[PDB]
Structures are given as structure tokens and as C-alpha cells.
Amino acid sequence: QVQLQQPGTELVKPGASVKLSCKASGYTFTSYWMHWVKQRPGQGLEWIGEINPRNGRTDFSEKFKSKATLTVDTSSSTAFIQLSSLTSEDSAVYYCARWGYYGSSDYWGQGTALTVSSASTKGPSVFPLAPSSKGGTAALGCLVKDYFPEPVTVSWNSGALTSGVHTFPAVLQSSGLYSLSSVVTVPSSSLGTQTYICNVNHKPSNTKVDKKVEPKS
Amino acid sequence: IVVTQSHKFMSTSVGDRVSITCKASQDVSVAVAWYQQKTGQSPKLLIYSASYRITGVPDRFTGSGSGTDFTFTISSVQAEDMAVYYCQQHYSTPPWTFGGGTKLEIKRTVAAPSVFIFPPSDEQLKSGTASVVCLLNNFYPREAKVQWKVDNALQSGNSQESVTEQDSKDSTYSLSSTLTLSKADYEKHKVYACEVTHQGLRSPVTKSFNRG
């Protein structure tokens, strides 16, 4: 019954400030400290700070005593973190968590994925990765390039092809736009018969692309 | 108070036992907690005060230790147990530091990658940029190296790669690497190759194409 509710994502420009929320329910909000925790892609958890909603008492890790401000709204059982003068380094998932009666973080929110970037919202271009010509099993795919922000979704043959597909994590290019690849392995005896199409959907820019992938001539 | 997990990665097998260690820089009596975080999800508290399980946590998860050295144990491992595990001290005063985490992987037999190279499409080449892609499919263990050669000149700083998580059905990894060049640069060279090094190949394997 204890739940901590956080928004999914937040996108802001460098130099801006942002206020992240965590709405608590199923317990007496003022009876437990609230904690915040940062996690950058593929890295470990990093404790940020804590607030006592009864007290207003707060504490921060060394690295964050200058960057964040903790507040609560007891009438709405919500805790907030405000992060100032943001840079790309601050892009991360930020979790709120309840500190238990004896300590330990016994309940967690789903986290807010914060992206700090100056890049414009933009849908991707989709290019075929054509199966080699000169075949027991062959590979093919599509390269999904130059979109912002995450995510895109990729399927094959409008959902009919799921076995053998690998869709790689997106990488951030120096331009500040993302790129990913999706590939699939198929019996090459079916290359001159079977049609392969990737279906790319990018909801943030309302862009949808269907790219046939064929052997070249 | 510094809390350290000395092993970032551990390989195990289904049905086996595995132990993860956490060492505190001071005596924290038994105030140590352990969290499981599966790919894409929020951390989940499994054990607090070194040995006490949260209601509903499966029986195969246990913890022990006192003072300064602490152990998390899975009595027998199930497939759904692959995740990163974290310790945290919760004794007396902040900062409530986390350990660096320990990621669990399934061990299996060595498997060489299948390698494929893909030239840029004509569609992209019209836009003024060329992406060459090299795919390493279904290999184990994770560690693998891709070297781009352009007329046998080794390339540096103009490629990016990404890796899948371990496949749940066959326990392999896959990796793609992307060489990006300006169209002008791509057209002034002829032979494009990626050379792959991996424990399952007794020699590095090359795939290549001529721009024509």
C-alpha cells in the first residue's frame, strides 16, 4: 500500500533549474525521512540528501550541498528536490525513497529520468543495413539516426518478426542527437522471397517511419 | 563511512550458490541493507539489519555479518535473479553511502561472435554522411574488441559501440560498432574493414568491403 509516485521524464536546457516531485501515499508522511538518490546510465546509486517532513531538517552529501534544495508540502504528502544551474552532468534518473523506521531505503519511487540538453526535438532518419550479397543465416537491420529525445521504438514486419532481433541501446553523438541500430538474423535462403520492413516510432516528435530493407543490386 | 563492494561483476549458474561481499570502513554493528535492481527497474530492498528479509522476499535470499564485513547469499540461483545488487549502511549518521554494486551474470560456454559488416546506404550517402556498421552477434563472454581499418590505417576517435544485456534464453551478448565519416572522406578511401578480437576466435577475424 506504500507508494511513492514520480513523473516519468523531464527535459530542460543547460543553465535552467528544475523541481522534481515525489507524491507519497499509504503511510503517515510526516513519520519518515524522505531520501533522494541519483543514478547515471549504467552507473551506481549515489545518495544525494534527505529531508524530515515533520521537522524540515535536511542533510546532503558533500557534492550536492551546493546544487540541490529539498522541500515538502505536508498537506499533499509530496516531497520536492530543486536542482539549479543544470549541466549535462546532471542528466540521470533521480529516485525518491522512504527511509525506514530503523533506517534503510525500504520503498522506492519509479524515478524521474532528467535530461539536460540544448538539442531540438527531432525525429530520426532510418537507413537500411542491407544483407550481404555473396548463405545459411544472414543479417540485416536498420540504422536509426539523429533523433532527440529518447526513446524510439523499433519492430520488424509490424510485429510479425520477433525471434532473432537485437535492438541496441542508443548512443549519444557529439551533435547531441541519438542513434541506435536494430538488427535481425534470418535464413538467407529466404532473402529473395521474404520482405523485411522495420517500423520506427518516435513519439516525442510524432514521427513514424517504415523502411524496407532489401539486398542491394 | 566508506562502504565497498570489491567485485563489480560475478558469473554464476542456475541452481548454484553465490555470495556477494560488502565491507564497511567502521564498525556499523549490523546496520547494513541489500538492494536488488533489475535492468530498467527501481531498486528493491531485500534485506535490512544484515539478516532480516522483507515480507515476501523469497527464501533463497539471505544475509549475514556483523561489525565490518557483510555477506549477501543466494542459496540457489534462479534465472530471474540476474540483476545488480547494492549494499548501504544505515547505522547512525549521514551520508548514507551506497556500495558500488555487483552485477550478476549467467556463465556458459565460450561462443565466438558471428561478424557482419554493412556499407552505408545510398540514401544516407546523399545526405552528406556515411555510417559503416560492424555487428558482433551472440558471443560469450562479454569482453570483445573491434578495430576499424580504412586502407589498413587504424581508426581512432570516430567510432561508437553499444552492447546488449545478456540474452535470457541463450546467455549471449551482442555488440554493434559504428564508424562515422564525412561523405568526402568516405569516398576518398577504398577498403573498409572491421577486425574483431574475442576469446572464442583463436585469431582476430576481419570482415571487409570495397566501396565500389
Q: How many CB pairs under 8 A join A and B?
A: 134
CA distance B115 to A184: 13
C-alpha–C-alpha distance, residues B131 and A144, integer Å: 11
Return d(Cα B116, Cα B136) in angstroms, integer: 7
**The total number of structural domains that make up chain A:** 2
Using a CB–CB cutoff of 8 Å, tell me whether A95 touches chain B.
Answer: yes
CA distance B192 to A23: 54
Domain B1-108 belongs to what architecture?
Answer: Sandwich (2.60)
> Which residues of chain B lie closer than 8 angstroms to A102, CB-CB?
31, 48-49, 90
Residues 32-61 of A with CB under 8 A from B: 35, 37, 44-47, 50, 59, 61
Residue B130 to residues A132, B60, B126, B149, B186, Cα–Cα distance (Å) = 18, 52, 9, 15, 7
Name the residue with cell 547515471.
A40
Check: CB of residue B73 under 8 Å from CB of residue B63. yes
Q: In angstroms, how far is CA B200 from the centroid of its own chain? A: 18
Burial class, B157, CB count within 10 angstroms (exposed 0-12 / middle 13-18 / buried 19+): exposed
Query: Same domain, yes or no, for A113 and A123?
Result: no
Same domain, residue pair A95 and A139: no
- What are φ and ψ of residue A29, in 5° steps? -50, -40
Residue A126 and residue A77 share a domain: no
Please check whether residue A150 is in contact with residue A91, taking contact to mean a CB–CB distance below 8 angstroms. no
Query: Using CA atoms, how far apart are residues A137 and B169, in angstroms rounded to an integer?
Result: 19
Method for structure elucidation = X-ray
The residue extents of the domains of chain B are 1-108, 109-212
Sign of CA dihedral A91, A96, A97, A99: positive
Residues A177 and A148 sit within 8 Å (Cβ to Cβ): yes
Whether residue A124 sits in one domain with residue A205: yes
Helix, strand, coil percentages in chain B from 3-state DSSP, rounded to 5: 5, 50, 45
- Strand order through the sheet with B9-12: B9-12, B102-106, B84-89, B32-37, B44-48, B52-53
Q: Which of A61, A130, A181 is opposite residue B176, by nearest beta carbon?
A: A181
Please check whether the two domains, B1-108 and B109-212, share a CATH topology. Answer: yes
A150 and A108 belong to one structural domain: no
Residue A7 CB contacts under 8 Å (≥ 6 apart), including other chains: A20, A21, A112
- Chain B residues touching residue A145 (CB < 8 angstroms): 124, 131
Q: Three-class SS of residue B25? A: coil
Residue B22: name the closest of B65, B59, B82 by CA.
B65
Mutation target for A interface from B176, B179, B209: give the one with most A CBs within 10 A. Answer: B176
Is residue A62 domain-shared with residue A130, that is, in the same domain?
A: no
End-to-end CA distance of chain A: 61
CA distances to A21, A82, B51 from A98, in Å: 14, 18, 20
Last residue of a domain, which of A118, A143, A165?
A118
Does residue A23 contact residue A112 with C-beta atoms inside 8 Å? Answer: no
The CATH number assigned to the domain with range B109-212 reads 2.60.40.10
Query: Cβ of B200 under 8 Å from any chain A Cβ?
Result: no
- Whether residue A59 and residue B33 make contact (CB cut-off 8 A), yes or no, is no
Which of these three, A118, A146, A161, is where a domain ends? A118
* A181/B133 Cβ within 8 A: yes
CA distance B104 to B84: 6
Task: Provide the domain limits for residue A40.
Answer: 1-118
User: Amino acid identity of B171?
Assistant: S
- A52 and A95 both lie in a single domain: yes
| A114 and A171 fall within a common domain | no
Q: Do B95 and A61 touch (CB under 8 A)?
A: yes
Dihedral angle of Cα B89, B80, B163, A132, to the nearest 10 degrees: 180
Specify whether A81 is located in the same domain as A109: yes
Kindly provide the resolution of this structure in angstroms, with one decimal: 2.0
Within this chain, do residues A114 and A128 fall inside the same structural domain, yes or no? no
A67-73: long-range pairs with CB below 8 Å, 24+? A68/A36, A70/A34, A70/A36, A72/A29, A72/A34
Work out the minimum CA distance from B56 to partner chain A, whole angstroms: 13
| B162·A169 Cβ contact <8 A | yes
Residues A186 and A149 in one domain: yes
* Helix, strand, coil fractions of chain A, as percent rounded to 5: 10, 50, 40
Pinpoint the alpha helices (H) of chain B.
Answer: 122-126, 183-187
Domain final residue pick, A83, A118, A153: A118
Distances B28 to B34, B47, B59 between C-alpha atoms, Å: 14, 15, 25
